[PDB]
Design a binder for this molecule. Structure first.
Ligand SMILES: [Zn+2]
Length: 223
RNA sequence: AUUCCGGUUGAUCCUGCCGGAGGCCACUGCUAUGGGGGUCCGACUAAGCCAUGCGAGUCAUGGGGCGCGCGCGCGCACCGG
């Protein structure tokens, strides 16, 4: 139903969209580690239909801003939103507008266009299971003055981190994690971006084939 | 739970302090059915002052006497340990 609807009620404008429509690309993982550019949210609407449910479209922050003139004040609205599948895919976006609906739509579209793969595992001294319920090793991220460090934890220990990190990690599919932070966390944008970059940095660590089995590393979706 | 949130601008990012949110101890406001267990109750200021009653005796198998009942048995003080 939705598959054919979204696939035949849309005409692409890029070669990636053309490939995805004609059917040379079928799985979400074939678009990432080649240096492609993504300019169409329909690509992700097709290769990942889970990012269209309202259960997976958390809005993270709304802010009001001002521009002064010789007449008066012109108001603007900034919206920070996140989208994701709960099995290894997450994206973050910002949108500016004069009304909240415009802002939210633009933010969700930018979030769709900015999506990343992450790795998952156990990693902890205290669980040593091979189930991908957490991250496999400790990682660091930064944006602005905010410095985030994520550490793996055991099962049943749920997301010891602020609310924005809770939401982003829940949408990425992580269930248990410890955290340490520095800087001004009361900036939602930079806190969220630092968590996002910490998650992205799971792919910048060099591993050996043994570690994969030792930690139950999963790239993207599982089973 | 190896956690955060509010506050300096016409709007923003920092630094930096104040506050909120948790636990334990003492005093106190309002209110109060039951049982069990425990190493709780004039310590913080005056180690300031005290009426009254009690908190250290015991030995007759160490000694002499005195009283009470049929040499013997009970009771009292003293010497002595
Ligand atoms: Zn585990």
């Amino acid at each position: 139903e939705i598959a054919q609807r979204v696939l035949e009620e849309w005409e692409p404008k890029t070669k990636l969209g053309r490939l995805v429509k004609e059917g040379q690309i079928t799985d979400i993982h074939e678009i990432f580690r080649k240096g492609y550019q993504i300019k169409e949210p329909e690509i992700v609407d097709v290769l990942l239909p889970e990012v269209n449910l309202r259960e997976n479209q958390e809005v993270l922050d709304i802010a009001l801003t001002v521009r002064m003139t010789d007449s008066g004040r012109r108001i603007r609205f900034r919206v920070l939103a996140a989208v994701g599948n709960r099995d290894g895919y997450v994206g973050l976006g910002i949108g500016h507008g004069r009304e909240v609906g415009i802002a939210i739509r633009k933010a969700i579209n930018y979030a769709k266009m900015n999506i990343i793969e992450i790795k998952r595992g156990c990693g902890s001294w205290e669980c040593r299971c091979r189930r991908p319920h957490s991250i496999p090793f400790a990682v660091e991220g930064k944006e602005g003055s905010v410095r985030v460090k994520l550490m793996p934890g055991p099962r049943g220990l749920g997301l010891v981190i602020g609310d924005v990190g809770k939401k982003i990690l829940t949408l990425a599919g992580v269930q248990d994690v410890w955290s340490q932070t520095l800087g001004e966390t009361r900036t939602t944008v930079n806190f969220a971006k630092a968590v996002f970059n910490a998650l992205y940095n799971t792919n910048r660590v060099a591993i050996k084939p043994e570690d994969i089995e030792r930690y139950g590393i999963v790239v993207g979706r599982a089973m």
